[PDB]
Design a protein that fits this description.
The chain is α+β, with helices and mostly antiparallel strands. The protein contains five helices and ten strands. Strand 9 and strand 10 form a beta hairpin. Bound molecules: a molecule of 3 linked components (NAG-NAG-BMA). The site of a molecule of 3 linked components (NAG-NAG-BMA) has 6 residues, from strand 6. This is Fusolin. It comes from Alphaentomopoxvirus acuprea.
Length: 261
């Protein structure tokens, strides 16, 4: 059990911001996308003939269980084709949990809605570099060893405004067992004194992208944890220093009236 604390996992961010315990309709949830996630599940339960209590419970469960975005793979867990087709074939940011009446894993599909999910902004010092090392921190709430981590990044064509995170849009960037280490004084992970930190070589992007983290138990039941992490690089402004030779308003209104429609 656990979640990504850096860059913060999408579901962990929603849980941390709170406001979802009351009113039951999700109206005190401050972030528009977290509120939409909650309301999606809440309205899905009501549409299936559930009571307001059942609907609030299902939507709250999705936020409360931010450390249990899990799926059971069974003994074939090492085979990514088995994972892709039978374990987490859909609703990747929910780790495939789409049954509000059955807990675990409930229905966490609100977290897989498409839209302007707020990303972690990673500033670049150089815009021409194609691999940016990120020290990812994963915050375990239970120590389940032996296990291993896989990290994927969305392909360059992925568009967060349009596309679901799906396996044909993901590329493997990291695959390793990772040691449990003491958290630093600046962590982030308040839930545990120890964390898993790993250097992930993130490919450059000029678009908002998703980092998809998989923590898989090396075990016969094959429980694995899956988290979507929203991120974007901020390109450094100004001219390319290598181009540079050394020395020896009604326009917005206009734009609005003359585009589209
Ligand atoms: C991440 O790295 C691990 C470790 O290298 C990869 O694990 C390897 O996964 C394959 C399955 O895709 C295993 O192969 C299978 O081996 C059995 C023999 O026991 C055989 O019957 C199957 O036909 C198949 O060849 C392989 O054993 C396993 N290696 C270890 C050390 O467990 C894993 O696949 C990598 N993940 C990704 C997404 O590539």
């Amino acid at each position: 059990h656990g979640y990504v604390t850096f860059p913060i996992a999408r579901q962990r961010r929603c849980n941390v911001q709170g406001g979802f315990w009351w009113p039951p309709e999700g109206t005190n949830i401050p972030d528009p996308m977290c509120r939409a996630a909650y309301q999606y599940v809440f309205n899905k339960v009501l549409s299936e003939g559930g009571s307001t209590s059942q609907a609030a419970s299902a939507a709250q469960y999705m936020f409360q269980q931010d450390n249990e975005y899990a799926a059971l793979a069974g003994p074939n867990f090492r085979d990514i084709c088995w994972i892709k087709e039978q374990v987490v074939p859909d609703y990747l940011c929910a780790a495939g949990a789409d049954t509000w009446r059955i807990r675990p894993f409930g229905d966490k599909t609100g977290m897989d809605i498409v839209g302007s999910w707020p990303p972690t902004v990673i500033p670049l010092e150089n815009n021409f570099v194609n691999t940016i090392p990120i020290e990812l921190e994963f915050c375990p709430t239970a120590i389940h060893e032996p296990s291993y981590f896989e990290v994927y990044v969305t392909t360059p064509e992925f568009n967060v405004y349009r596309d679901k995170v799906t396996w044909p849009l993901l590329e493997l960037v990291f695959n390793s067992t990772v040691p449990l280490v003491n958290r630093r004084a600046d962590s982030l992970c308040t839930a545990n004194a120890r964390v898993y930190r790993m250097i992930v070589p993130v490919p450059y992007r000029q678009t908002q992208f998703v980092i998809y983290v998989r923590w898989q138990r090396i075990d016969p039941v094959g429980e694995g944890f899956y988290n979507c992490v929203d991120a974007v690089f901020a390109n450094r402004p100004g001219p390319d220093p290598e181009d540079m030779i050394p020395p020896p308003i009604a326009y917005a209104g206009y734009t609005e009236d003359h585009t589209g429609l």
